[PDB]
Every structure is written in structure tokens, then in C-alpha cells.
Design a protein around this ligand. Sequence first.
Ligand SMILES: [Zn+2]
Ligand SMILES: [Zn+2]
Lengths: 86, 84
Amino acid sequence: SPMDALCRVCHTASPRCLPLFKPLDDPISGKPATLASILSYCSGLEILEAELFLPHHICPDCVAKLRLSLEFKRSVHRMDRILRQT
Amino acid sequence: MDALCRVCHTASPRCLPLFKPLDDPISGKPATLASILSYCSGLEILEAELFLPHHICPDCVAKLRLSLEFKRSVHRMDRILRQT
Ligand SMILES: [Zn+2]
Ligand SMILES: [Zn+2]
């Protein structure tokens, strides 16, 4: 239970929750992607490290739904660009 | 030629119409596949743009349903977290 962190999406306590604010890439222009910037992209919510009293992690099942959401949103945008000659 | 999917551009004789009213599958409230797609993607899916596809294939509708369930779950938890 001290072994556990709470998921920002479903509030489950899991010892395998992943940190929302850890960089997943090291890009040369601009800030790294994080699970929080992907969650914000998919959900439209502000997911900000500065709100220190909210959950800062995401459980493996919610990360799985997030990955599908991201692929879907990116596919909708990619097609929209192609269709608009963008 | 079969109808083209707005999301993946497959031509399918089983594509579904974006602009026909149905009940939102989470809220039960009036919606269309276009208003749900717009809500999940952040793009305007408007019938008046007559040069763009007006249909969506059953595979992309399945991904859309998962996307909507996920977005609504994130928002429901946010309300609980910020709840009076
Ligand atoms: Zn979760
Ligand atoms: Zn499709």
C-alpha cells in the first residue's frame, strides 16, 4: 500500500503505476513527451505536475487504453491533413 | 465505388453514415458518429464540407467507441478529484 501509487485515470492503487512526468524521449527541439503530455493530448485535460496533491501516476491498463486513444487520434489527424492537401 | 472512410480512407460497402442521429453509447443522449468523432479528435466533422468523406468504416467506429469510453473515464475521474 506504501508499495502503491494511485492512477490519475481510474484511481486504482497499483505497484506498477507508471510516473506521468518522466520523459519518454529526449528530443533536440522542445520538451520531452511524457505520459502526462499524451494523456493531455488525448483527453483535453491539463495534466500538470504543479498540482502536487493529485495522482502523478497511471496504471498499466489505463496506459494500454491511452496508447490506443493516441494511435486513433493521430490517425484521424494524419488523414485530415492528407484530405485537406495540408 | 463504395463509400470511403473519413478516418482510414478504406473503401467499404459496410461503411456507416457520419451524420445520422443515434444515442451516444455512454450518455444515451442524441449524437451522431460525426459529433463523437469530433469530440474525441478535436476536429470539426461537419456535413457541409461536401468534398470530404461522409462515412466511417466499422473498424474505425470500434476504435472510436474505445476512445470515447476512455475520454469520458478521464473526465469522470477529474470531476471526482476536483469534487465538492
Ligand atoms: Zn488506471
Ligand atoms: Zn476506417
